[PDB]
Symmetry: D2
Subunit: 249 residues, 4 copies
């Protein structure tokens, strides 16, 4: 079966993509990572030795190498990578013009993924594999009031095109999920200060959350399993672009 | 109360926006138009003399003048216009490089709306009113396989900015609804040939339809009722941009 | 030699592209069109029976069929089309919300080109030929104060992608020239009223004109002569995108 | 006179903007920075005590604080900042999927500027000042083969909008210069390996360089001197957008 790495799997669309992968195919193996062990254990308990995980922050290169080494050690190869920064959540000082906070958010949403692709790339070359990015719909970047939360998340869009131009033995695609990726579980509101999210950002964020997926998760899952078509290699698309019709449920 | 014109009201998001307007405010009057009389009658029967309609094709200027004259005759003014081309549906020969079919689709999705704005503009100037466009999310125009269906629909985006620059006594905004606007009622599939939609377009279209709103309808409805903020005049935004937090449910 | 149709050849970049085509290759034949006969005669006098023209408005389908028939009659085939709406110039009432003036500008900048592609398409299929659009740089459509002048001109961008998806035996590309295409000859200022161009548009227009090409003309000319690469088929790019390095002087 | 900080002043458009500022106004003082002292000395020798500089890398926060402290010490205030990453040049390993090289380029083109704005912001608030970014035209990001060179440079576009939303006592604008900013002085070609620039990037780069400004430099200079209009605060525009007509030569 295909060996697929998936990041950001604790919540939101990353969790759904794991769920969908296992329902689509009986042979696929998934190695996931998230920062919290609880939901990784729950996935391991549900899916058994179809699922393996590393716990930690992918802004640590050591965590990335653990995850890549664990897949090659345990199953001998890597077919695909579903590169996902995970759900939107408030991060300290991002609503300020604060280079330290911006660098930290760009490392969460963009550079850790660049680092992971670089680390996994030699295995992906071996299988002529696929890199599927879970990017953001906020390509209305045109106008966006999401500040650094939006620009850092959307940086994967151009990255897909650059990776596919530069590395011809692999394919890459960036797909927007038609929603703002948030934790879907009913949660107590958190006390979020204005240096972290503007009042508007917080109010929309809560609205969206208190409103929120299997359909776009399937698109990502089918691209990772069956491969990216040549005609969309390098591109960034909504999950509902007609060029993706064969990757729908 | 505010006098609001709404187009494309038979189905999909245009119908929802009428429903939402009436639930938000007891004083608002709406003049709608759609090509089919059945669902207009049903709206008239539900809402009584809060709702008035004209039946016909807004690619006819006579229909536009009827609707504008009827609002000024019946209620003396027009406060806002919700300019909506209505739900996506197959149109003959659009999937061919056929200038006649493209002109006809651009008249449906774009020029009829330009014509309506021009016709209503002198009344809107009188009340310093608002023009709210129901535009498309397929601002991933960047990449889009929706052919002319996508480009014609999205032409309202730049139009908002041009109208707000050129006409300072009115405000305008183009808001994407976070979905592809389709008829939401359970329908028999229609036999659609390849000159009208590619196989991919048809397969995605059916998927989307067989999957499909009150939340984005509220944003449009609250913009039309309360007015467009100065800071977003002229712009094109997703319904879930934080600058629109105060227009959510 | 290759048989190439070129529109908008009287002035600006369209004229340069003809000049460049003839300097690159001794075998190429060009059929051009422009509305004014004077500069067409001058091209015929300079290049002789390498150049043929039709005089007229390409918003007339009869002019389009004349040009296509003349190429097939005179040289038996058509290899490439350089689709160019020609230089920016004031057009009546475009700076008003006036559907008639907008339709007329969209026919000049967009629909006549759609019509021409449809008319020439069966000959282009015969030679697996190339459609090169001279599109606008004002893909900062993101923000643009050029009103309808900008949106109508830029409509070729999405059209390239749709044509290349729909017609697999041909290739298409839309290339921005890195300038606003204007008449380069020293001219008396024309009296332009505010319904035609805002004061700002007119002042920038004159500035640009009084400032204004062989380099981007070469890119278009080399794409038409040598063919569009598979990796850029369907795309819209600046003339200076690195994927076009081999089409530079 | 106005006190204006300008970065990237050794070459290309940043140097031109200093030249233009001094020719426009006899009272303006400029504090510039560049990594090489030679061309800073030459500017100091030409303009005398109208010009002050710090030598160093603005990816060093100490250099940024020196420059800001020097302006407040020497002239008591800061009116405007022209934030410019400087000319395109090959940087090691950027044409590889190499997170270290990408972070270093993003610090050069984006984070150092974020850091500078944060550092200067309290002085800019005092004078209700202006932040003018020299951004890239490669907003055809839509399609771009410039890899990380393009995406890192263009990150200033969204940053302008976020800064102007978040800091209401200042104005900000990002303006594209209508050219790829390169060193304009006739130079020996440098031996550039493929890990630094693809063959295509290098070939276009040399072409552009061997081809390459006072007009767009004036736009930036006039925005910094006279202030950013309310109607374009927060936006990203080409230097030739009509909303900028009053900032032309």
């Amino acid at each position: 079966g295909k060996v697929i790495l998936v990041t950001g799997v604790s919540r939101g669309i990353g969790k759904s993509i794991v769920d969908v992968l296992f329902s689509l195919d009986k042979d696929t193996v998934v190695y996931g990572v998230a920062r919290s062990e609880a939901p990784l254990k729950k996935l391991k308990e549900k899916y058994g030795d179809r699922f393996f995980y590393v716990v930690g922050d992918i802004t640590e290169d050591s965590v990335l190498k653990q995850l890549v080494n664990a897949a090659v050690k345990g199953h001998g190869k890597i077919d695909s990578l579903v590169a996902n920064a995970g759900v939107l959540e408030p991060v300290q000082n991002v609503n300020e013009i604060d280079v330290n906070a911006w660098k930290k958010l760009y490392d969460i949403n963009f550079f850790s993924i660049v680092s992971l692709v670089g680390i996994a790339l030699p295995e992906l070359k071996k299988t002529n594999g696929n890199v599927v990015f879970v990017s953001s719909d906020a390509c209305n970047m045109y106008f966006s009031s999401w500040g650094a939360y939006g620009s850092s998340k959307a940086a994967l869009n151009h990255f897909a095109m650059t990776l596919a131009n530069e590395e011809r033995q692999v394919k890459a695609i960036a797909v927007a999920p038609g929603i703002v990726d948030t934790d879907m579980q009913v949660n107590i509101r958190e006390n979020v200060g204005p240096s972290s999210m503007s009042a508007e950002q917080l109010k929309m964020f809560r609205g969206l959350k208190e409103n929120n997926s299997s359909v776009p998760a399937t698109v990502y899952a089918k691209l990772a399993l069956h491969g990216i078509p040549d005609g969309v290699n390098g591109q960034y698309l909504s999950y509902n672009d007609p060029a993706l019709a064969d990757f729908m449920p």
